[PDB]
Curated annotation (Swiss-Prot):
Domain of life: Viruses
Swiss-Prot/TrEMBL catalytic activity: Thiol-dependent hydrolysis of ester, thioester, amide, peptide and isopeptide bonds formed by the C-terminal Gly of ubiquitin (a 76-residue protein attached to proteins as an intracellular targeting signal)
Organism: Severe acute respiratory syndrome coronavirus 2 (2019-nCoV)
Ranges where the Macro domain occurs: 1-167
Subunit text: May form homohexamers. Interacts with N protein.
Role description: Responsible for the cleavages located at the N-terminus of the replicase polyprotein. Participates together with nsp4 in the assembly of virally-induced cytoplasmic double-membrane vesicles necessary for viral replication. Antagonizes innate immune induction of type I interferon by blocking the phosphorylation, dimerization and subsequent nuclear translocation of host IRF3. Also prevents host NF-kappa-B signaling. In addition, PL-PRO possesses a deubiquitinating/deISGylating activity and processes both 'Lys-48'- and 'Lys-63'-linked polyubiquitin chains from cellular substrates.
Membrane-topology descriptor: Multi-pass membrane protein
Activity-regulation annotation: Inhibited in vitro by GRL-0617.
Subcellular locations according to the entry: Host endoplasmic reticulum membrane
Effect of residue 31 to A: In strain: Mu/B.1.621
Protein name: Papain-like protease nsp3
Result, substituting residue 164 to L: In strain: Gamma/P.1
Span within the parent record: 1025 to 1191 of 7096
Amino acid sequence: VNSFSGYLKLTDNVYIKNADIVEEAKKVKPTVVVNAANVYLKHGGGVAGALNKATNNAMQVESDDYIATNGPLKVGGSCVLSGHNLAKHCLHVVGPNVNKGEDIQLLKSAYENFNQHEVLLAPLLSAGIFGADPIHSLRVCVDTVRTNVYLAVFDKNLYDKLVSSFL
Ligand SMILES: CS(=O)(=O)c1c(F)cc(NC(=O)[C@H]2C[C@@H]2c2cccnc2)cc1F
Ligand SMILES: [Cl-]
């Protein structure tokens, strides 16, 4: 039993809700919140910009030190950093950005990072400003993630379409 509330159950391990991931994280304080990161951990907009804003820029400060030490992530890769006031940990995961021409096949590799964590609060990878089809992202999530994932979808219209079209 966990504290996630109001989710629709899609499969044995995948759950979904129309919610602002920032507000959801502040309420649940999950062990892991997933960020929709880029390879530079520049949290400018989308989910990343919102999460970072909610940390009062502490996420960005920590991220800049991470990059200075380690260099950029790979597309499809991840790193674990602090969750600040939102979660114990933040798993920064880089899905392919279609608006940069990146291989959509890397979306499966990106979701594989979730399997290293027993329970996660997450957005749909490569959705939103990353330019991929969110219906496809949900399909890859369900077919790749085996651990317990709670998906927050900000847009109510999109949430209803994802549920109604789910096979
Ligand atoms: C007062 S706060 O600082 O805690 C704070 C905050 F800075 C930002 C947000 N959410 C936002 O910006 C959503 C539009 C951002 C979004 C979410 C999910 C996917 N794509 C975009 C909520 C907060 F509660
Ligand atoms: Cl977004």
